[PDB]
Design a protein around this ligand. Sequence first.
Ligand SMILES: [Zn+2]
Length: 227
Amino acid sequence: IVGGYKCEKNSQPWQVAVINEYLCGGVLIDPSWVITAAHCYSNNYQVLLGRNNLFKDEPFAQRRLVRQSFRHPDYIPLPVHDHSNDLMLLHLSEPADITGGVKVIDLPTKEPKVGSTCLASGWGSTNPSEMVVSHDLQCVNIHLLSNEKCIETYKDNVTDVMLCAGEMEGGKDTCAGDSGGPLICDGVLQGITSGGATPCAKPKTPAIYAKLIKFTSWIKKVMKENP
Ligand SMILES: [Zn+2]
């Protein structure tokens, strides 16, 4: 998170850290499921829950293993790779404890409004040009912008599955390491951060997020088949 602030202690209880050869964010949607970006795909993972500081002895800290991962079918890995359908479900080895620090967040049930105020969190890069892992969870308030503002949305019909957010002025963005974290507008979880390569927070260059609302059906069905 470039241009944000330190989130208040345990104010984002559904935020997880997904770790393998990549740092990613994740979001707890069920004691047993974590949604993240497909970009974070790997043979293994370590899921960190209930944390503020990634490198600290914290009380609600939990660590889970993954049993199985499900990348959205239409994601094309880095055939030309794009950031549409950048979604992956992680089925936890054993459920997360729902504590005063670890809680689930709900899937959205309504379409996001252009101009609504959104918050994004992560331990990703706080420097827009180079990668500086942040120990503390960072939070930033941005805006839901018209998809017209995001150049990526003009491809095929990807507009359909993407949200566009940030500030036209730059200075505030999600960045490398933030992929897979949440985008919460007006209190709703509406997006999943996609790939955030440096440089970030460029003026007139808002970022791409998975329009969650469009994948709940897929999310639903998967969890259903994986009791
Ligand atoms: Zn990519």
